[PDB]
């Protein structure tokens, strides 16, 4: 009826899933070791006749070094032993190897696990791809799995929660090669792509939250929390329910323009909101800050075209439109002329949970703002600049063509990204 399948792959995806299933077990009465000490757990969990609940996700990786700790640690009691797919050799920051030579082979088990996970669920709703844009297993293997899922399942919805290279913070050097070369594959066979990066989450954890020296667990728990409200209405009753398939006909005006942002406003420490009243009119007004975004873009130079607000917990349905109307009256948030309506509202009846002892503060309100803007077009200009400076002398092409395929796909990047850059300019031109 209302089940969904989320695919975790790479390292960023598997660590995000490691943090996310903590929250998924905490929302319901499911213990971390599977059992319980009600039909709202069918979206993420299946039921076995002995009381064991089995998750509906997959953990696939070409290295064993990060799936071993799941297979040996706190959560080896939860996940399916054959869904814990491990590889042999790393893709090693290479699109070509993990797309053509080693990533081509192991999908005969990945797709089989996806099939057996899909034969339990009756009303399947969509796919949540959890990977990263700048690796070999994240950007090459998940891309090929997305090709195969698109050519097999047809018109099922596909969503991407992926790690985007920050303008300054970047741990690898082959990022623009296997990041842009994924975008030939994404926008043809995708419906939305909720990008995040790592610098903006550092800024949020540092300034809004007050944690110093943050490990990856803080970022991954924030990611799990913002994707916890994207499927809030699929499992929890609410006054204004917004299911999964009506996200795309609200966020996507054009099939090319399906690259939205993401924002979770009530992210704050325990001893900061204790000196605060957290009214509705000052939470959704904080979703529109440039300092609250999970991707480094400036919405002051961007032009909003679609929006969605997915409220949680004790939200009065009256102050929501009173908070939207004052936004409409202010001139700091400008829309395009061909969208005179703008907004979309969803209200739920469940407060956001907090991990016990975690950095987040307990509240009974939660706002997730999803919107696509023309300011994302600058996030592609910098990667195009990087590829133009790096491919000009054929920097790292020998590691790519050494798997057996030509460099023509690198030459296919410039016309495709030039079209994606100039049509974004075209759809934001005023009426003249």
């Amino acid at each position: 009826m209302r089940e969904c399948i989320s695919i975790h792959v790479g390292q960023a995806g598997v660590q995000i899933g490691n943090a996310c299933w903590e929250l998924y077990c905490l929302e319901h009465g499911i213990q971390p070791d599977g059992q319980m000490p009600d039909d709202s757990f069918n979206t993420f969990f299946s039921e076995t006749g002995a009381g064991k609940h089995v998750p509906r996700a997959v953990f696939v990786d070409l290295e064993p070094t990060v799936v071993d700790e799941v297979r040996t640690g706190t959560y080896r009691q939860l996940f399916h032993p054959e869904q814990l797919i491990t590889g042999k050799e790393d893709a090693a920051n290479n699109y070509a190897r993990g797309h053509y030579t080693i990533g081509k082979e192991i999908v005969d088990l990945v797709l089989d696990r996806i099939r057996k996970l899909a034969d339990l669920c009756t009303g399947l709703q969509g796919f949540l791809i959890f990977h990263s844009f700048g690796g070999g297993t994240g950007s090459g293997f998940a891309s090929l799995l997305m090709e195969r899922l698109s050519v097999d399942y047809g018109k099922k919805s596909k969503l991407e929660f992926a790690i985007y290279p920050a303008p300054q913070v970047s741990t690898a050097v082959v990022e623009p090669y296997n990041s842009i070369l994924t975008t030939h594959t994404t926008l043809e066979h995708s419906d939305c792509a909720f990008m995040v990066d790592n610098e903006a989450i550092y800024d949020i954890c540092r300034r809004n939250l007050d944690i110093e020296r943050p490990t990856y667990t803080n970022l991954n728990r924030l990611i799990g929390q913002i994707v916890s409200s994207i499927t809030a209405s699929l499992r929890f009753d609410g006054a204004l329910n917004v299911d999964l398939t009506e996200f795309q006909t609200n966020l996507v005006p054009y099939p090319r323009i399906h690259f939205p942002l993401a924002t979770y406003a009530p992210v704050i420490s325990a001893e900061k909101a204790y000196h605060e009243q957290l009214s509705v009119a000052e939470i959704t007004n904080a979703c529109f800050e440039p300092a609250n975004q999970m991707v480094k873009c400036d919405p002051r130079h961007g032009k909003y075209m679609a929006c969605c607000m997915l409220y949680r917990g004790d939200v009065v349905p009256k102050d929501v439109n009173a908070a939207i109307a004052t936004i409409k009256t202010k001139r700091t948030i400008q829309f395009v002329d061909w969208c005179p309506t703008g907004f979309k509202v969803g209200i739920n009846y469940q407060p956001p949970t907090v991990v016990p002892g975690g950095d987040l503060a307990k509240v009974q309100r939660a706002v997730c703002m999803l919107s696509n803007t023309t300011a994302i077009a600058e996030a592609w200009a910098r990667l195009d600049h990087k590829l133009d400076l790096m491919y000009a002398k054929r920097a790292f092409v020998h590691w790519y063509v050494g798997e057996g395929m030509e460099e023509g796909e690198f030459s296919e990047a410039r016309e495709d990204l030039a079209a994606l850059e100039k049509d974004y300019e075209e759809v934001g031109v005023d009426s003249v």
Partner: protein, 56 residues
């Protein structure tokens, strides 16, 4: 000296443009349509933005 009296009698200079006065219970929008996207806009040649079918 009377021109100086006229000089002090000049009141002031404003900085914030006053916000828009809105009326409720009418069928008027908050942000007006610019009337050039109404019936003066024209589509472009590369507007091939249609529905992407299944695979073939």
């Amino acid at each position: 000296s009377r021109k100086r009296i006229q000089d002090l009698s000049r009141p002031k200079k404003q900085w914030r443009a006053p916000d828009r006065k809105l009326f409720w219970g009418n069928q008027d929008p908050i942000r007006p349509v610019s009337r050039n996207a109404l019936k003066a806009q024209m589509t472009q040649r590369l507007e091939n933005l249609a529905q992407s079918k299944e695979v073939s």
